Design a protein around this motif. Structure first.
Motif, PDB file in Angstrom:
ATOM      1  N   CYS B 338       1.832 -13.719  -8.595  1.00 12.87           N
ATOM      2  CA  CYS B 338       2.230 -13.257  -9.901  1.00 12.87           C
ATOM      3  C   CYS B 338       3.336 -14.168 -10.494  1.00 12.87           C
ATOM      4  O   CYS B 338       4.426 -14.298  -9.924  1.00 12.87           O
ATOM      5  CB  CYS B 338       2.768 -11.810  -9.816  1.00 12.87           C
ATOM      6  SG  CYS B 338       1.425 -10.542  -9.727  1.00 12.87           S
ATOM      7  N   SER B 339       3.023 -14.775 -11.648  1.00  8.86           N
ATOM      8  CA  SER B 339       3.978 -15.476 -12.493  1.00  8.86           C
ATOM      9  C   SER B 339       3.931 -14.812 -13.866  1.00  8.86           C
ATOM     10  O   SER B 339       3.144 -15.232 -14.741  1.00  8.86           O
ATOM     11  CB  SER B 339       3.623 -16.959 -12.549  1.00  8.86           C
ATOM     12  OG  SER B 339       3.701 -17.530 -11.237  1.00  8.86           O
ATOM     13  N   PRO B 340       4.730 -13.750 -14.101  1.00 11.87           N
ATOM     14  CA  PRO B 340       4.561 -12.936 -15.316  1.00 11.87           C
ATOM     15  C   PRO B 340       4.819 -13.736 -16.579  1.00 11.87           C
ATOM     16  O   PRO B 340       5.726 -14.584 -16.630  1.00 11.87           O
ATOM     17  CB  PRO B 340       5.591 -11.809 -15.134  1.00 11.87           C
ATOM     18  CG  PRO B 340       5.751 -11.684 -13.644  1.00 11.87           C
ATOM     19  CD  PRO B 340       5.703 -13.118 -13.181  1.00 11.87           C
ATOM     20  N   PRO B 341       4.017 -13.523 -17.622  1.00 11.94           N
ATOM     21  CA  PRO B 341       3.981 -14.480 -18.731  1.00 11.94           C
ATOM     22  C   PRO B 341       5.116 -14.411 -19.729  1.00 11.94           C
ATOM     23  O   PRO B 341       5.099 -15.222 -20.655  1.00 11.94           O
ATOM     24  CB  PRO B 341       2.637 -14.158 -19.405  1.00 11.94           C
ATOM     25  CG  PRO B 341       2.388 -12.750 -19.086  1.00 11.94           C
ATOM     26  CD  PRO B 341       2.883 -12.584 -17.678  1.00 11.94           C
ATOM     27  N   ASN B 342       6.083 -13.497 -19.592  1.00 15.63           N
ATOM     28  CA  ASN B 342       7.262 -13.494 -20.456  1.00 15.63           C
ATOM     29  C   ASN B 342       8.543 -13.962 -19.743  1.00 15.63           C
ATOM     30  O   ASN B 342       9.638 -13.614 -20.148  1.00 15.63           O
ATOM     31  CB  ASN B 342       7.440 -12.126 -21.134  1.00 15.63           C
ATOM     32  CG  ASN B 342       8.407 -12.155 -22.314  1.00 15.63           C
ATOM     33  OD1 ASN B 342       8.221 -12.892 -23.243  1.00 15.63           O
ATOM     34  ND2 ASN B 342       9.449 -11.360 -22.241  1.00 15.63           N
TER      35      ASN B 342
END
Ligand code: SF4
Ligand code: SF4
Ligand code: SF3
Ligand code: SF3
Ligand code: FES
Lengths: 629, 629
Positions: B338-342
């Motif tokens: 997981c690399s959250p987009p915000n």
């Protein structure tokens, strides 16, 4: 009538029977959905990809981002990309089966043979393969090479894209970084990108969609269609019967339905055996007949003549339920989409037997599962005939009332790049000359499905085609939208009388219709060979040509993957109904306004046939002005 | 506030900083979504797959079927299958990169080496590979063989499944016809089946899901994890520091984050170079340190020690935003989900630099893109160190106030099958014996993400694990849910005293915790090796064993593909929150009630830790009773 049915009288007549019989059908099922439509999904601003969902974008309520932090533009483009993995997977599936079929045919284990040996050897030479030995050796080498193109990773350069793409596109694709892997790796990479918390950047996701489109055409479609020509011949123009009046209830009627033509061809070969015609006659039928449905049917009518056995093409996917309501079908043999999943009750009511011939196709109420394998297709075709004979005897004959509409239309099918070149005297130059002179303003690739979203079946498609030819725009057509034009009468020489002054003159001189049937949506790659030949001969880029693409009643992502390809290939690409993107404003701006400065292409929208035709003509005229013609 | 946050005090402290800084974050973004949740999507009874949609099932308004004819059961299972294509694609992507990395390592083009030669030769023997030459030659052959398993089609038999699955399961799979293709073909076939009007049969779609799960474990996960062991060592138990207090703001701090650990290992090797420590000290830092986040971090703590360079694991994916709020990170190097987009605005506020090291990972505001290739990873790691030093000097040092929570927990990481055997004295016998005698009732594989859907971060996972061990159920843990248990203190020797009477005493005698850290969700295949070993030792089928699986705060389809595998493998498989299926009654019946008579497994649901643990124990005790123990 407030329920959208069809532009075609035959379909409307059979809808009346479905309704009287109180059977569910796509036309009627549209109406309850209209009571409770979700506008978030309509606009592409909902997401169901992880358990923190389901999410919606609504700035007014404070829901500016999904829980994970993705914005509306990333959300919409990501779901588009994920669905387009399905479209690419279907073309990749079909390509792999074509290559295995070619290999197994060369080894002697199918009822097929190597028909177009000239194409086999020219393709092998263009790809720098070894052509020593016998044709069977070359065919195995070509099959293995084209399997390699399916399997190549993002770091191994392709060869198909070098042979078959135009020169000026290559520099654009290099600059943008969109030369793809083979479609198997590309679709896996696209699917992995769509997992939550991976790729949330709408520009990146759009770029990946363009790459996926390129991988589909160069890595699957061109190879598969040329291999099918090697097996079954290269299409040339010939007259074909279409529409639902081709059925005669006193014969045993087998219909093949899907996108892969192998079972259909095996059925025609088996039905030509005297032993099988005798079986049909001993069962009380006049004889045994084979019919094509949807895209598998179109593949066959491109390459095969009508005769006493093979009777023609029924229509596109919204004709399948009506077709069963004729009460004339003995077996419907289903190989891929579209095989709609509520056919079971209709087959039961109308005395037809459903047979799946693909591991992909399953739904409630199917009678028989004969999954395809090349070495089994001879036996599959024979078992289907045996099933159909029994079905006629015990399910249909004497029990089911037939109700076959009187409508039959003639279409000239089988246009290919080779047929166009032959019609022009062996060179593309006469086509260039009539375009430069303004007799033909430009050309449109109509590559399309059908749907009920934006009108009765085929309404937008047929009327848009009529508006384009009136404006002296030649159409090359593929997909369910091609079947629509054939049934509507736009693909015969009488249709010249519906064309404008310049196009009607050219059509009469060349003895061709104003709409040229190029086959299936799988033939987007093949149509690109015509546009590529135009671009190369003029030494202009595809984005400079007086052409456009339209998918004006798109349904599924075979159509949208072809639209993404068209964008990557630099073209004005009209799509209706709207894809689920319109709630994402920066994505809309990218696709509709900024792409001309990136790939050269752009998405256009709308369902009014006259406005769509005007906008296409305006783009063509803008390209013409920049060329000085 | 009423916002669901976390069970971990460190995360709650850092959430307060995010909220006071008025930065968007997952915790706060959940609340607006709660205002407008779609109950159709929650239940799996919406569809957005073609232009006739978006469709909904609601019988009370006459919307019984989608426009195409699909019913609620087909609709729900089809969208589950499509999302699981993403999960399988990520594992397949990872496997392919592992195999290329081993190959390039053997050829001398990476900073890695062959660490576990015993494992390399044992695999070669088991897979009947040629072992002539040097270890590097064998490694190339193993890499090519495992690539072949990725690419195998549905009609060529696999070898990994023969070697690594137990006899009775193989017979069940053969009888059910669910032996899969290699994962590349299987995922392509699944995606193609999901296209509109292809596969609309919930039973078929569920079968395809089971096949996809088998293809993932045997065709990707087992090979990739054993290849990572060959490269980086087989884990053995050792003490590790976890939770966000491991940071020290006076050092240059590089965090690697994702699921693929190659860049992280390369960074550790580069940071051990004296010249790079000298560079860090000249920039004003005490030295240069590397830290792991999420699953990539867990892969490294499984196999590497804490030292002056490598400092431990931060936490799971809901810790990433809090981690940036420490104001202590110089580079966050991101390789997969997981690399959250915000994260962009958070990196800007707290003076951290974001680096993507995978072409999969893109989102707004990323500073640097260093796509991984084995032959470039040395250069990539060095560039990351260079970026981190400059970021420390120019963005963070003397500018950003650190707020590092005090919390550090100890966990024993590195359990593997080999570690269990060693702790038992060389054979599995002692564990079998204490299970037979009733000291340990059974074992659970906890294979989980984290989510906010069914509680504050990690609430269900940690409380469920406490209730399981109290009931004398040993846990083998993997995934973000494993990280949760480590941070909560369930993976150290003090946790022995949280276990029930029998399990506490076994663990005390063996000097192991009651929760054994087995790594990542990617280690489901590896767990199955332990469960398979139990089946063989007892001479029983896996469906007969006193075991279960739980994914009690699942988020994405890596977890669900592991659950589908578990079902195919015959196990009681608890999943929470509910997958989006519960609006489809016949699908629910299949998954929860009929599968025990088909594969032996079943889905269980619920988020109450006591009820879920009681239900797991009841299943385990039923299995015990049927084994006579
Ligand atoms: S991926 Fe993001 S937007 Fe989609 S359901 Fe999950 S949290 Fe919501
Ligand atoms: S696939 Fe069927 S249920 Fe889904 S949107 Fe299309 S018509 Fe509706
Ligand atoms: Fe190949 S075009 Fe798209 S809709 Fe399904 S048969 Fe039609
Ligand atoms: Fe491999 S477990 Fe599923 S959520 Fe994303 S890092 Fe976590
Ligand atoms: S149907 Fe659920 S958000 Fe549209």
């Amino acid at each position: 009538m407030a329920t959208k049915t069809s532009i075609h009288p035959s379909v409307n007549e059979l809808y009346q029977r479905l309704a009287e019989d109180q059977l569910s059908n796509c036309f009627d099922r549209f109406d309850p959905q209209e009571k409770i439509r979700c506008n978030y999904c309509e606009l592409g601003v909902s997401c169901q990809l992880c358990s923190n969902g389901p999410c919606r974008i609504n700035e007014k309520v404070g829901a500016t981002l999904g829980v994970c932090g993705i914005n509306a533009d990333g959300m919409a483009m990501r779901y588009m990309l994920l669905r387009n993995v399905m479209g690419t997977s279907t073309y990749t599936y079909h390509a792999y089966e074509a290559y295995k079929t070619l290999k197994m045919t060369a080894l002697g284990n199918t009822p097929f043979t190597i028909t177009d040996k000239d194409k086999l050897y020219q393709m092998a030479k263009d790809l720098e393969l070894n052509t020593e030995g016998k044709p069977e050796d070359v065919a195995v080498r070509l099959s293995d090479f084209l399997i390699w193109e399916l399997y190549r990773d993002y770091d191994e350069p392709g060869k198909m894209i070098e042979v078959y793409a135009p020169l000026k596109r290559k520099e654009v694709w290099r600059k943008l970084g969109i030369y793809p892997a083979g479609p198997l790796h590309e679709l896996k990479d696209a699917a992995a990108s769509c997992l939550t918390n991976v790729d949330g950047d709408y520009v990146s996701l759009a770029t990946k969609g363009l790459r996926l489109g390129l991988s589909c055409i160069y890595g699957a479609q061109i190879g598969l269609e040329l291999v099918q020509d090697i097996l079954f011949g290269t299409g040339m123009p010939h007259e074909m019967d279409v529409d639902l009046g081709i059925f005669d209830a006193d014969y045993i009627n087998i219909v093949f339905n899907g996108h892969e033509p192998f079972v259909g061809v095996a059925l025609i070969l088996a039905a030509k055996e005297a032993v099988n015609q005798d079986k049909a006659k001993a069962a009380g039928a006049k004889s045994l007949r084979i019919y094509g449905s949807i895209e598998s049917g179109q593949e066959v009518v491109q390459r095969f003549q009508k005769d006493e056995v093979f009777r023609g093409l029924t229509g596109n996917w919204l004709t399948i339920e009506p077709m069963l309501a004729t009460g004339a079908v003995d077996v419907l043999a289903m190989d891929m989409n579209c095989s709609p999943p509520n056919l079971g009750p209709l087959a039961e009511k109308y005395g037809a037997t459903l047979v799946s011939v693909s591991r992909l196709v399953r739904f409630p109420g199917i009678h028989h599962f004969l999954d395809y394998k090349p070495s089994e297709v001879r036996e599959i075709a024979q078992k289907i005939i045996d099933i159909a004979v029994d079905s006629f005897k015990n399910k249909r004959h004497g029990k089911i009332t037939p109700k076959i509409p009187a409508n039959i239309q003639k279409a000239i099918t089988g246009f290919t790049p080779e047929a166009i070149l032959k019609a022009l005297g062996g060179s593309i130059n006469p086509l260039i000359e009539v375009i430069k002179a303004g007799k033909i303003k430009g050309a449109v690739g109509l590559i399309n499905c059908t749907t009920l979203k934006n009108g009765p079946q085929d309404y937008v498609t047929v009327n848009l085609a009529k508006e384009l030819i009136k404006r002296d725009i030649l159409i090359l057509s593929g997909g369910c939208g091609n079947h629509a034009l054939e049934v509507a009468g736009l693909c015969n020489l009488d249709a010249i009388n519906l064309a404008g002054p310049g196009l009607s003159e050219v059509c009469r001189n060349l003895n061709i219709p104003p709409v040229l049937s190029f086959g299936t949506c799988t033939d987007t790659g093949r149509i690109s060979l015509v546009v590529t030949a135009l671009a190369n001969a003029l030494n202009v880029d595809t984005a400079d040509l007086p052409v456009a693409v339209t998918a004006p009643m798109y349904m599924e992502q075979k159509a949208t993957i072809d639209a993404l390809f068209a964008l990557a290939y630099g073209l004005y690409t009209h799509v209706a109904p709207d894809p689920p993107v319109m709630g994402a404003p920066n994505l809309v701006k990218l696709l509709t306004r900024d792409l001309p400065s990136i790939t050269g292409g752009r998405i256009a929208v709308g369902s009014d046939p006259v406005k769509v035709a005007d906008d296409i003509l305006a783009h063509i005229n803008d390209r013409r002005a920049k060329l000085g013609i």
